[PDB]
């Protein structure tokens, strides 16, 4: 009692962004690349068009 | 600007250029040496001038 007193309010928010981020998932792949500079030799055929 | 083609050294090493690069690096040139001479599809034995 005998004081009176001065209120400023104010608010905060708590949010979660990264639980939603993530790394889905990773994949790779196999390629034979046409460099010339070879030979044949190893087997043959296969794979014909 | 001739656009000569390497292959790197020795067969069946890693270096080499490319098939895909082979093509276009091959083809253009054709076209300057034809361009030139050849202005068009066909070579000009008796040669090509532009005007």
Redesign the interface.
């Known amino acids: 009692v005998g004081f009176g007193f001065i209120a400023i309010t104010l608010l905060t928010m708590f949010i979660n962004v990264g639980l939603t981020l993530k790394h889905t998932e990773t994949i790779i792949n196999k390629y034979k690349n046409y460099k010339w500079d070879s030979g044949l030799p190893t087997e043959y055929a296969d794979r014909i068009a | 600007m001739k656009q000569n083609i390497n ?3 020795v ?10 690069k ?1 093509g276009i690096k091959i083809n253009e040139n054709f076209d300057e040496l034809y361009y030139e001479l050849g202005d068009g599809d066909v070579p000009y034995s008796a040669g090509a001038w532009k005007t």
């Open positions: 292959i790197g050294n067969v069946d090493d890693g270096t080499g250029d490319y098939l895909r082979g």
